[PDB]
């Protein structure tokens, strides 16, 4: 009809049977008659791999390859999916949602989770030099092979069944471990990622598994998280689509990012949450949300982003390195980071910034006349006029876009690994009424043209009426609000990558003298009407003795109109900037 | 015009520079004007990943996914590629050739190799309880991380460069090891695969010697240990949905998987070519030398050398698809079973399908398809013109009735490889003539099953004539020199007749013990005549074998009196009398 009921196509709740193909037929009928809504009777729905559509997908900042997709929303328009607060359980390697060249899509009232997490967790029962003793719950199946290696499994165990289980070992490969505080259910204070690779020596003590690595260190009683090595199955992919809304969507887990958007226009996530399911301390294995080369309005409103293994959000562009200079008008650009391969974005009549790599200073803006994709890495680009004579190979290009207007309000950011928000948004950005409790920098202006190759550089930011409670209590960043753009030291005085930032009306609850602001190459920033409250939530770090570290900047104002409470010193010292951590 | 010189498009020999993009433009020009030949000035040409065309590919019996292709021959026609005996070096994860919906393609006069093999080799310098001491040459770079695990690298080592190299580790993952005899450069006598997984505990002694730890490690000092590549991502030449393809004087030194893999293709010829290791290596391709899946017309392997590969020299078979769901009396959903079979679409309307009982490989009936709908890379819904056999159950399998390929395999040399020689799963007219076999596994194996590999076999017209089987089946990959191992349960061996009409004549069998020359079951009409059987002492005799002919559940089998046996102690009457067991 106008509204389609999935149960009319065979998708039946609370049975544990695969509803993938019944859902697919309901989707095709909705496209056939132009139905405006698809609804689920409230219940549990399970989705498996065997009948899910297969498509080749390049997904920015995630792993490319063949994807089995449960909701293949390719070229859909004016469609709402209302789950009625149903529970969606995905079995194996599945991408729940991919929105590809779709328009006006509303996802509403359901939860996403996987039958077995791609990461793994264990209770730390013992510890010593070069080892940890671990106890695994049943929902993290594993085995120790004859080589003495710990390998997590999709399930415990004929020959063809064993072969299928053997092929699933890739999905649950680890690469590092991170210790989580048991009581606070957050990354352990000042703990760092401990790299291990995908092969840890292990042996069962003769229910306790002992793992061996010379860099292992953790507190007994805490939770050890095995970080998933891959990002193959993000929760919701928004690709080349527009006007997408997520309302009351719970993403309990994903093989990578919860929501990843690329080259998409107008995206809203509201009243949703990324939070672990029962028996887990971690939600998604990568960023909660992420936006690449997106335009229009990006709205994160009244969400809860917690316990994921990476940043809550990152809104940025793509830098493509200048690999080959052919003639004075033609260049061949190359995508650099492996998870950026296959990102096509340079089209004829586009305007490109021609940026110096080590400085992030734009030489000029040139217009593209022709574009030719050679591979998933290299694209040949010819300009309308000869480009700047100073451009060398190793510099980078970036697309001049109608940069996304960022509206991030009412969100809770806590318990996650790494940073809170990477504000690489050059458009008008508003960060209002958010709560931060992150081990890394609550807010970070990053971007570089040497590794990540992410285009950042703000020009209109307002950070107002937020609460920063005991954030940056570890080492993922350089302060509560910090700049860490990829600018060489010899260019910091010359470059001005981030401009026009207002930080007002916020409350900073801090436990030591870590930098509240750590800025370089910033032009025009005002810090006024904020409250700085001293706490004793974590042990004080002797590394830091300055709340405001400022270098190679101009027009920075740490106004007298700021209230400080609980400190022994006064504004004369604590509000005076330094060049070092002091 | 008619002949395009690739150097006219910037492909320069003997420079080490990437010629991928120059070659691509020469290919597009040949298609634009209908050129008939592309020539390479004789020299060395290097191809890299950075500018290779990317396509999704499903390659049967190999690993699917994104492929970077150096020669993307998609919808090319009447084109010859003459390398003039050039050397093509491929750096990293590249598929050298993919022929997709192409016709009348001839490849001749060049060699294919990779700058670093996907497998690894080492000299065994020492041994002890639960370990092996290994010495790796410079062309097999490796790392031992802080976890103490051996991880082979694309090269020895900037932050971005370290990330690129680290991502290459997946390409060189291992899963098992095999011992090779140093002097004879073959799998060690009676040695078997030793499973390890992709993670071996290792430590560098003092450096230069690496000690690997595993309780099942066992090998002779002085021999060579081969680390089997875990993946089959980069086969040498892929022939997919194409027709009339010829390979002449093609040297495939290495591949990430199979040398030549053909699927759903008509008329293929491989002549005067060879699969053999490059300098400093004991192994060539990491999987089958040649392989043909659902192929039709004529398959010709003429005067080739297939040696040192980690699998069979050839396998010519069809695809069994299991009946996963019965919708109604006319409608089923079939499912591809083996992971390296996913994405193999082959059922179309008007196709006729065999409907086969799984455990017996006995065909209930043939039925014609009216409707076909691909659901995933595993499941396809099929509707038939008439209600199918009432005895058909979920778990049985279907197979496409095809104009099964006529197989002509003449003048080849098959030796030094792992596993078997030729898997004769070809139901079409098959001729095996004037070949030389020296395989650790069965020289000729009739296999097929509908429970794991899901490969359709079952011959109907085989002539094995004037071949030389010298000291073959000297290890354990099979059940004899010429053996059947079709997936037929013992319950049904007596009523199932999967292989029919086989003639084995004029051959010379040089054997070192009394392992079975023929090990047959479920065979009807076989004649073994005019053969010469000669006793050797090349390998130690195996006491568990005491019968040259082991025959069970068969009919019309003739081990004729006109065969000749030399060098044995027992009488001719006793040596030609078949048994049901390996001994008595
Ligand atoms: O900074 C850009 C980068 O951030 C996220 O990931 C990295 C992670 O890969 C690394 O190991 O740690 C840092 C924290 O120190 C970040 O978490 C994004 O997932 C990634 O796509 C990229 O955007
Ligand atoms: O038998 C069918 C099968 O044969 C080949 O490989 C297998 C190999 O995977 C296994 O480990 O050992 C056997 C020998 O005992 C064969 O070498 C083909 O590569 C495979 O595609 C399939 O056709
Ligand atoms: Ca064709
Ligand atoms: Cl305010
Ligand atoms: Cl103080
Ligand atoms: Cl600093
Ligand atoms: Cl300092
Ligand atoms: Cl040594
Ligand atoms: Cl015995
Ligand atoms: Cl006699």
Numbering used by the authors:
A (entry chain B): 25 to 181, 190 to 238, 241 to 616
B (entry chain A): 25 to 181, 190 to 238, 240 to 617
Q: What text does the study give?
A:
Here we focus on a GH110 enzyme (PdGH110B) from the carrageenolytic marine bacterium Pseudoalteromonas distincta U2A. A campaign to identify enzymes that could hydrolyze terminal α-1,3–linked N-acetyl d-galactosamine and/or d-galactose from the A and B antigens, respectively, and thereby provide a set of biocatalytic tools to perform this antigen switching revealed a set of enzymes with specific B antigen exo-α-1,3-galactosidase activity. These enzymes were the founding members of GH110 (glycoside hydrolase 110) family, of which all currently characterized members are exo-α-1,3-galactosidases that are able to hydrolyze the B antigen glycan (Galα1–3(Fucα1–2)Gal-R). Overall, the results are consistent with PdGH110B representing the founding member of a GH110 subfamily that exo-hydrolytically processes terminal α-linked galactose residues in λ-carrageenan while providing general insight into the specificity of the family as a whole. The overall fold of PdGH110B is that of a right-handed parallel β-helix of 11 complete turns.
To trap an intact substrate complex of the enzyme, we targeted this residue to generate an inactive D344N mutant, which indeed lacked activity on pNP-α-galactopyranoside. Crystals of the PdGH110B D344N mutant were soaked with an excess of αG2, and the structure was determined to 2.20 Å resolution. The refined structure revealed four monomers of PdGH110B D344N in the asymmetric unit. The monomers were organized as two noncrystallographic dimers with identical arrangements to the crystallographic dimer observed in the PdGH110B d-galactose complex, supporting the concept that the dimer is a stable quaternary structure. The C2–C6 portion of the α-face of the d-galactose unit in the −1 subsite sits on a hydrophobic platform created by Trp-486, interacting through CH–π interactions often employed by CAZymes. The remainder of the −1 subsite is created by an extensive hydrogen bond network comprising interactions between Asn-85, Glu-488, Asn-348, and Glu-480 and the C3-OH, C4-OH, and C6-OH hydroxyl groups. The +1 subsite is formed exclusively by the positively charged side chains of Arg-451, Arg-208, and through a water coordinated by Lys-207. In the αG2 complex with the mutant enzyme, Asn-344, which would be Asp-344 in the WT enzyme, is 3.1 Å from the glycosidic oxygen and appropriately positioned to act as a general acid. The structure of PdGH110B in complex with αG2 shows a small pocket, which we will refer to as a +1′ subsite, with the appropriate size and charge to accommodate a sulfate modification. Notably, the architecture of the −1 subsite leaves no room for a sulfate modification on either C2 or C6 of the galactose residue, indicating that PdGH110B requires an unmodified d-galactose at the nonreducing end of its substrate.
